[PDB]
Scaffold this active site. Structure first.
Site, mmCIF file in Angstrom:
data_model
loop_
_atom_site.group_PDB
_atom_site.id
_atom_site.type_symbol
_atom_site.label_atom_id
_atom_site.label_comp_id
_atom_site.label_asym_id
_atom_site.label_seq_id
_atom_site.Cartn_x
_atom_site.Cartn_y
_atom_site.Cartn_z
ATOM 1 N N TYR A 1 49.185 -23.480 9.178
ATOM 2 C CA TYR A 1 48.364 -23.001 10.280
ATOM 3 C C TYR A 1 49.294 -22.645 11.438
ATOM 4 O O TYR A 1 49.889 -23.523 12.066
ATOM 5 C CB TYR A 1 47.341 -24.062 10.699
ATOM 6 C CG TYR A 1 46.159 -23.487 11.451
ATOM 7 C CD1 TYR A 1 45.843 -22.139 11.357
ATOM 8 C CD2 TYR A 1 45.365 -24.290 12.264
ATOM 9 C CE1 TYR A 1 44.769 -21.603 12.044
ATOM 10 C CE2 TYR A 1 44.287 -23.761 12.955
ATOM 11 C CZ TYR A 1 43.997 -22.416 12.840
ATOM 12 O OH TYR A 1 42.928 -21.876 13.519
ATOM 13 N N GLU B 1 48.880 -20.648 14.533
ATOM 14 C CA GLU B 1 48.333 -19.966 15.709
ATOM 15 C C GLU B 1 49.414 -19.679 16.750
ATOM 16 O O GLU B 1 50.285 -20.516 17.001
ATOM 17 C CB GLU B 1 47.203 -20.780 16.349
ATOM 18 C CG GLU B 1 45.946 -20.858 15.508
ATOM 19 C CD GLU B 1 44.784 -21.491 16.262
ATOM 20 O OE1 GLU B 1 45.018 -22.474 16.998
ATOM 21 O OE2 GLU B 1 43.646 -20.991 16.126
ATOM 22 N N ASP C 1 44.639 5.888 14.442
ATOM 23 C CA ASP C 1 44.463 4.992 13.299
ATOM 24 C C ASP C 1 44.935 5.741 12.062
ATOM 25 O O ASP C 1 44.226 6.613 11.549
ATOM 26 C CB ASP C 1 42.992 4.574 13.170
ATOM 27 C CG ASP C 1 42.715 3.779 11.903
ATOM 28 O OD1 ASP C 1 43.675 3.483 11.155
ATOM 29 O OD2 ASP C 1 41.536 3.414 11.676
ATOM 30 N N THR D 1 46.462 0.100 8.109
ATOM 31 C CA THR D 1 46.338 -0.974 7.152
ATOM 32 C C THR D 1 47.556 -0.913 6.256
ATOM 33 O O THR D 1 48.282 0.099 6.233
ATOM 34 C CB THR D 1 45.059 -0.839 6.309
ATOM 35 O OG1 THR D 1 45.087 0.421 5.639
ATOM 36 C CG2 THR D 1 43.814 -0.915 7.216
ATOM 37 N N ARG E 1 46.334 -6.246 1.368
ATOM 38 C CA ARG E 1 45.294 -5.809 2.298
ATOM 39 C C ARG E 1 45.513 -6.488 3.658
ATOM 40 O O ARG E 1 45.714 -7.704 3.725
ATOM 41 C CB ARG E 1 43.892 -6.165 1.759
ATOM 42 C CG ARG E 1 43.422 -5.250 0.617
ATOM 43 C CD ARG E 1 41.876 -5.070 0.566
ATOM 44 N NE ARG E 1 41.426 -3.962 1.415
ATOM 45 C CZ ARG E 1 40.594 -4.087 2.451
ATOM 46 N NH1 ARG E 1 40.096 -5.268 2.774
ATOM 47 N NH2 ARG E 1 40.251 -3.023 3.168
#
Lengths: 401, 400
Positions: free
Chosen positions: A53, A55, A182, A208, A217
């Site tokens: 984790y 963050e 984009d 992406t 992805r």
């Protein structure tokens, strides 16, 4: 006995995953927005990085123990910067949608107006394409001058021609708007120099990592403006996301290493060449293409002059082992659920090794089918021929890496 | 293995192995951390990453979805069984996206949300009293004063059972929805080791890694068909595009484990282990918020001490124990420094620790905090803990 533990533990999931591999191997994937991930990318995705984790950003995490994931994320960021030749990158977005949401949150306020392409947190207005399948930039300019958006967005899923970033920026400048590009659908071409870069025209660029870049992805955001970079970082975390997907970030870094290689330019060029063969054969076989050809990885067929619908074409092709998608076209006369068009793309077939000769073969078969769209026996026959053809281009020996 | 990765990208390969070594050698006590099943990771590194599957099973934008539809359906059905609810959405990319989906489904931009405290919407908060528990009458009067459209319950550092019925009674008084985010306790809930938020919550969210040992990701659950429709629309196309199919398959595998008999044994051991940690710390004269716990975590309070939560966190870190500083009721320090420390048992339980090992680690924690600046003690304990850890290895490799 690869993934034998999964097979013993959850045989249903294991079997379904192998069936999906069989489907990817046996059929021809011509959905313009799909691609085939590298085995090396997949290997790192199934890793213990999922347990971390993390963050915050590298060197600035909320929890301790991030020495190694900070190095991994830094590698992803540095490769991304090198790939787009830009000064700042954020590789945390969980998807293209989250990337775009992050850019909006960074640049404008809730309720503000966005002008984007069409083929409530914010107010939306749109520009489109003309009957000849191209953007009319004078019309966009007129729309922008009357709507006065705070942000103009460019990029589209079914646009077959080069996006003129310079004209979009000229338009944004007239009305003092930001320009956001984009480039998810064309990023793999951009980094190879097979499509013009959105820099320096776009203030911010998103993409992406799977579609065109052949990575996992996920999303990414790039910019050259340090103030905007700070705003983007805050918008992604804590604004829109919590901890990032570290196994995906490692996968992104692996993908970028491939994108940086000499092999990548060869791939990207072949994608365009293959699309040119696709377009030329279909037109020689007397089919109408929107814009009468392509500049990139996709072709959009128009059946306004034809007996059958886009959904009809999609289903016939599907029955012949070819996966594509129906798509509306300029001058559309049918429901958006039926359409009068079909979108086809070459990235995935190119990834499995198809070249001009294979493209010509597939293109002629597509033509054969649409010349006789109700002949279900013809589709069955072609399906078997295509499965044979595809058997010479297998890139995955297994479903799980 | 992963020889292809080792040859192609040695830097990433090496860093991933170092991270494995770090997880093996250290003692993970961040309450929200856990260890994913090997079988879950196996399916994550699969060709399902290649399928673009916008929409829902049987109603996709693209053809070729026969098999991913069966995978997602399986995830949905297992999720419904696990939470005993009538609707589930397994597409959210994360807990954050799950929650955004719920907000987008239930309320409008600008609407007010009342949520727990230790641009799109207005936010108001309730908190915890000095005795470490929620005062529900105070929550009620905040709700009556602020009139939010949505009340949220669930918290990352609350040590006691959440009274879902009282939250719903409060919501009902003001005509608000109740949203339970149970990401931090879901593994206990599905095992019957914490009461369920249903039928009190209108909608429930969770993440799939922290407490359920599945992959990182989010889920949304409800019993109301009208809300389920709003939820599905919010998630797609409102908040997301195509789902991560490799992750959805991984969630399915995880749920299968959560449904097994072994899961209840795991969840009970999580709570037992947390009782051991709590009891040892209090025997060693440390203060705990609410003087104990009902769940997987304990929150230490250092208001009666010269060192901060940050000091404690760094001291434990040096001794090889990962935890995190946390604010506490009556907080007197900056929230970036804090006067507390959150500790949890899910990860240690996952690697096989039981009461005996918990007692060892808890006394080491007490030793360190009794002499927080003793750097050599930390170094010695680190050595002892690495030895202890070497006997509890659940991964033989970094990539599956």
């Amino acid at each position: 006995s690869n993934a034998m533990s999964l097979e013993m533990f959850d045989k249903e999931i294991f079997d379904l995953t192998n069936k999906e591999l069989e489907r990817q191997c046996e059929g021809l994937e011509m959905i313009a927005s799909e691609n085939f991930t590298l085995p090396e990318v997949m290997e790192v995705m199934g890793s213990i990085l999922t347990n971390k984790y993390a963050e915050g950003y590298p060197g600035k995490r909320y929890y301790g123990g991030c020495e190694f994931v900070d190095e991994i994320e830094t590698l992803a960021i540095e490769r991304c910067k090198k790939l787009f030749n830009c000064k700042f990158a954020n590789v945390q977005p969980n998807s293209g949608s989250q990337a775009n949401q992050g850019v909006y949150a960074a640049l404008i306020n809730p309720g503000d107006k966005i002008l984007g392409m069409d083929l409530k947190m914010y107010e939306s207005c749109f520009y489109g394409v003309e009957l000849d399948g191209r953007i009319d930039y004078e019309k966009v300019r007129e729309i922008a001058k009357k709507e006065k958006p705070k942000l103009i967005v460019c990029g589209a899923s079914a646009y077959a021609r080069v996006i003129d970033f310079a004209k979009f920026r000229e338009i944004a400048d007239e009305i003092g708007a930001y320009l956001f590009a984009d480039i998810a659908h064309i990023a793999g071409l951009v980094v190879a120099g097979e499509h013009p870069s959105p820099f320096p025209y776009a203030h911010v660029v998103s993409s992406t990592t799977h579609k065109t870049l052949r990575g996992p992805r996920g999303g990414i955001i790039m910019t050259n403006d340090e103030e905007l970079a700070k705003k983007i970082n805050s918008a992604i975390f804590p604004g829109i996301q919590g901890g990032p997907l570290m196994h995906v970030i490692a996968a992104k870094a692996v993908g970028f290493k491939f994108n940086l290689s000499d092999e990548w330019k060869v791939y990207a060029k072949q994608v365009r060449t293959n699309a040119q063969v696709l377009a030329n054969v279909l037109m020689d076989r007397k089919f109408k293409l929107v814009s009468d050809g392509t500049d990139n990885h996709l072709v959009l067929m128009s059946f306004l002059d034809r007996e059958f619908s886009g959904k009809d074409a999609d289903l016939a092709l599907g029955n012949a082992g070819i996966t594509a998608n129906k798509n509306t076209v300029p001058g559309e006369i049918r429901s958006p659920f039926i359409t009068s068009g079909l979108r086809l793309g070459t990235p995935a077939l190119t990834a499995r090794g198809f070249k001009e000769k294979e493209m010509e073969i597939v293109s002629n078969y597509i033509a054969d089918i649409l010349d006789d769209v109700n002949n279900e026996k013809l589709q069955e026959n072609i399906k078997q021929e295509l499965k044979k053809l595809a058997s010479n281009f297998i890139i995955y020996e297994r479903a799980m890496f």
